[PDB]
Design a protein around this nucleic acid. Sequence first.
RNA 1: UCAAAGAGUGCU
Lengths: 69, 454, 459, 162, 62, 269
Amino acid sequence: VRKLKHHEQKLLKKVDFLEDYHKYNRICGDIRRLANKLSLLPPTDPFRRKHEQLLLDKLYAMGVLTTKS
Amino acid sequence: MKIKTIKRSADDYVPVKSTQESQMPRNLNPELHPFERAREYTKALNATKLERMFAKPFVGQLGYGHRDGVYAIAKNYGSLNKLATGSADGVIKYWNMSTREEFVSFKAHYGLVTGLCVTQPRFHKSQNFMLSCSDDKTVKLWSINVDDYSNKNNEEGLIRTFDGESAFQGIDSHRENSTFATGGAKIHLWDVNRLKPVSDLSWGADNITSLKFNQNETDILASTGSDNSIVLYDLRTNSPTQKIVQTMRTNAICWNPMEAFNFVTANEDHNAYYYDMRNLSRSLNVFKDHVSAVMDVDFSPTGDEIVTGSYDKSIRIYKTNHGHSREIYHTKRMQHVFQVKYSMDSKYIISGSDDGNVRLWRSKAWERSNVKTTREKNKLEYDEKLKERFRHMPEIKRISRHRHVPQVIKKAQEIKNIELSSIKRREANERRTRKDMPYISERKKQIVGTVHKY
Amino acid sequence: RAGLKKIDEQYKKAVSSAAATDYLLPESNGYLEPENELEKTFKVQQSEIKSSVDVSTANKALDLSLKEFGPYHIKYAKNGTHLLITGRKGHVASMDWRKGQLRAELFLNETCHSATYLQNEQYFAVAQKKYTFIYDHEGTELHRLKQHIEARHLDFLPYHYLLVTAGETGWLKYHDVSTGQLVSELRTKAGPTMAMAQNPWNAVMHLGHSNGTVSLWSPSMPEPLVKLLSARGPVNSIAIDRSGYYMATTGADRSMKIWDIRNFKQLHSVESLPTPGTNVSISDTGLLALSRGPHVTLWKDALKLSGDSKPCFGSMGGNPHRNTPYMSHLFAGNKVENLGFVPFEDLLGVGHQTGITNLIVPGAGEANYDALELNPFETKKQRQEQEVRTLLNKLPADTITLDPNSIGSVDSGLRSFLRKKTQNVIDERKLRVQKQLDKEKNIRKRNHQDVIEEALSRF
Amino acid sequence: PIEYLLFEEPTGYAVFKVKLQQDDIGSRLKEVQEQINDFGAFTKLIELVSFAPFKGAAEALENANDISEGLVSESLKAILDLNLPKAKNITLAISDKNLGPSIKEEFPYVDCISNELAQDLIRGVRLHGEKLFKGLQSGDLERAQLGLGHAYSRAKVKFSVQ
Amino acid sequence: NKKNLKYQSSAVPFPFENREQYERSLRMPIGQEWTSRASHQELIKPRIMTKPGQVIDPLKAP
Amino acid sequence: KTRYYLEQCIPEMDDLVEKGLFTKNEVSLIMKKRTDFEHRLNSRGSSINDYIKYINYESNVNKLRAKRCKRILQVKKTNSLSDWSIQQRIGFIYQRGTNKFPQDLKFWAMYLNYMKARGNQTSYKKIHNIYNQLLKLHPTNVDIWISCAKYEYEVHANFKSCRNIFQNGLRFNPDVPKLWYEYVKFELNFITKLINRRKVMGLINGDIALTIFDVCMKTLGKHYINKHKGYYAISDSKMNIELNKETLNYLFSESLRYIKLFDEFLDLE
RNA sequence: UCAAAGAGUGCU
């Protein structure tokens, strides 16, 4: 719509409904929920440690990580 | 066979000229305009929100104010932009409200200026006159050069002085004639061309704390005494007429310009009482939104609105038919409101507080003084009813009723609701057992006694 | 009495002003009556009406044949400048028939159920399979609604700025365009919604199901206003007249049902339909349109209480009580996808798989249009002025009601431990005192309202 | 309390009627001062009622001499008489305080105002100029002011083509 | 179908002295989309008026 | 505010339909043409021809109503709002056009003529009000000073006020020789009718002009000196002689023109 | 060119 006047703006706000990195943002977010939850799982567990290593190796094997992390 | 179809003439709806206004066809078929009741309500609600946006009552202050607290405000009933003020420093000022500047300033009195009134003395355009009284036992008449008309071209300063045996505490001027009345230890009637009091009026030995001539029966006069009494006077008989004793003193009296027999009283008991001059055994209306003593009260020249200036640092606007303030005006800059007067166009409010400043306030906070277009007009009065109609709509009440009030005022308000609730509960407990306890009307609790019974 | 009387005359004055403005209205609706009693309004064939109407109207009638994504559902904007037609296989194009310019072109290859303009020509929403997609005037998609899944019906409320979608999932989505938020989510419990329609008077949704019950729905309330079954079979379509007095449906069992919303009573029932209606439509003038297979039959003055007004196919020996079809048109070798009247013009649009056709029917449109509500001649700058104002005047969802006239009526440590003990005792006393007051009140009401035992009664 | 306003133009004298009186208390407010600038608002305040063009160059100078000395010319006496009612006393706005006594002498029934309120209206008239004349033939003021310039200023010094 | 307390008036507004009076006036549309331009002008009009910049004297003897 | 004007006419068409003069279809056509004019007059770029066109169109509507009144009702005047409303509204449009365009002397002229023709319907006081504004707006136009002087010396025959109009006009325009001639011509007309009345009085039983002559030379000379001299006096002695000569030549032609006036009046000496 | 978005000017 046209630019709303001052009194129009004050009465009504957030009425402006109706390069994109959305996928990479989702890729980054998905990596977060892993390491957050992989922390939730107990440290002595063998299943968590291998799974953490597979992730670190693989984002390394990508080059998202320039060095081992 | 016969066929006709909906047919649009392009020239009719799309003008041939670029500058010609296109025709706006209109059909008032009710079905074509659905959701009346939701619609007007939404226009109502938007108006209340907008009203709080433009509610901008303060406009400015007059010059640099007075040195000491301002304790006498006198308005020129024949001019818009003329005002007379005085403070306890003994200085009196005459103001040009348009330019917010002083016409002239006088060190009139050695003591505190206890009364002021603007007059047109008929000594037996180019100048105006004002009368001042104080506790130094003198009343002085002054003349002011003004620029209202340019038909001439001086003699600016003291014109005449009235010496008195006792201190003068209040002054008012008769409208039709040059005579004026002063209230001190004894209320005295004076004539301009006569140095000593023409007539002596007094109910008794008690002194008089204020007086206000009626604006319509200008021959009637009313006064207030230190003994919590209101005395009525008549000039045709040259004698007092009526006295009523109330529970607590009244500080100011003003007569309703649209209702001559009707006057309001500024009282010390957080209240302003609306009285009919004919039957004073009761009141017409009582105004109870103040939290300290009410110092001054004034009527609108429209007659539908009253302000009351209180010791609680607030000015409250009341409707004559409603007993609670629709509006509250306050500022931390306003230290003790002692005088509240109107612009006699009924559009602005003049207030005087002991901090030494005389402030100007809009009567209607959201109204603006500029000339509006008919379209601007027709929309603005569309809101005022639509707010009036849906005034008790709860959300409309919430947004409309809300005001920013000082913390001292509400902390005073919340407590008095507690003492009053304690009284009602405790009295109500006595209704369970006491056989004979009369119900006391609110309109008669403040009256202690009246001399002339009817 | 004088106050009640005084209030009365302003209405008789106000309606008098309304009667005064009725003269101001520039033009009237159309007519079609035969000069000779032998001539019949159903006998007249559409090409003859095309001849009678002037050149511009012949241009106003549009016929375009295209088969790529058939069938095509036609939807018509409120202001009516712009046509939106959505193909079944997925092709949707937005265009203005009067101007002759296409607003945007979408060639997406996803099966499409329905489409509709939301607030203006500029923004419109098109229902794809398993999701709802919104497209700009430029053709760019702005957002896609994850909440709205598998909706075969799209319906938008102008005064409330809310898009309602009905789908086979049965979950009724309430989405507000201005706030960009889903107002409420509700499950019908009547299964998939076969038919969807809105009543303009009260802005109440109407849903159709296999059982035949019609559920009246609003965003505000948890469960529907009203449940009515008029047709034994599934209700394929629901039509509500412009006034809102009359509500019309066609059952899948060939039943046609005329109903009243305000009184919730059945006007007329017709079981003589040869085949179940594809869709049923109602004019602003009150004239109803029904399409069955390749034949479309229209009845004038159908929405009236009188039995003689009852629609009847053809006539029974030319009986005056029988109501003949006002206009009868059949598209040979064709099927009608949907019917959309053309508000503000005297035409009826009909949707087919071969293409979209517009038929000219006298009296179809409203005679005169209010400029403030909607204007076909709205310029680019005022449509923005109209848009912002209608936003400013947005109606809340909770404001929805069964009757617009009903709304607005008048109805630490140890010390804190000691603190609780006292408050409990303080609270306990109030209960005791309140009991004594209640008991004393009862005594007031009671007071207000063997020979030997009497001798011994004193003891 | 203003009703009529006397404005002098180098082409002639135009008197105006004040339809609406601007608020006197709120004269210094922001919004009212803007109304003076806005032509649409101003036309609601006042309206053109008369205009009397000067016959020629000679009249403009001798009136220009008379206006300056606070004097009333025969043209000023003529235009005012037909307009201001005999009438309590009709109120006329004049930019000059010195011209006030001269008007009062000729016309006892008119009272003159030159307060800031009168100045506010007079300023607006000068601001819009011939736009308020609503098409009345005033030629164009700018060259008339310029033409009256060497008519007025250069008279006082007593040069000669000598 | 219970009515929403949010939209029910708490008490009868002034100047109307009875509940039925208000349900009547409430069935007026004041808006111009339902009311003729002129008919708007009698409804639109406020009771208290004033003219800017003039003198409101006390009433003279009737 | 176009709708306001449209609404003021509603009672009238209702009266037209009620009396049966105009059908609802014909009434609608009159409304549609009326609507186009009102938007035209209220819009930007509106000109006087719009007022004239609307007045001319509205005048025709009055004529058809009058013809149909005798044709259908068979009545000279039907006692209802229709009779005086078209006539009232035309004056309203004249007021707006004259108010909107005070400059055009032509538009004012029809207004006076239109109201003058309907003398019974428009009081002579209303003609007075129009002239007072017109003289006030255009004081330097001699034709209007002689206009109202001619109207009332013939229709009303008020010599006192007819003297007054000229008496005002000469105050504003003392340099125009035409206005002096008409005020002399009126003066001898008053004397001759007075003397002819005196002759008639006997049957059933002037210097003042020469004074108007006297001053008429003096001021015309003064103004002619003011013109042709510009802002300043003329230093050269010789030119001042030609300036005097030019006035004498200008002045004599003014006098000779009046000698021709005397010949017309036979009764006067 | 249309087509959507800004920022000034004239004037009711």
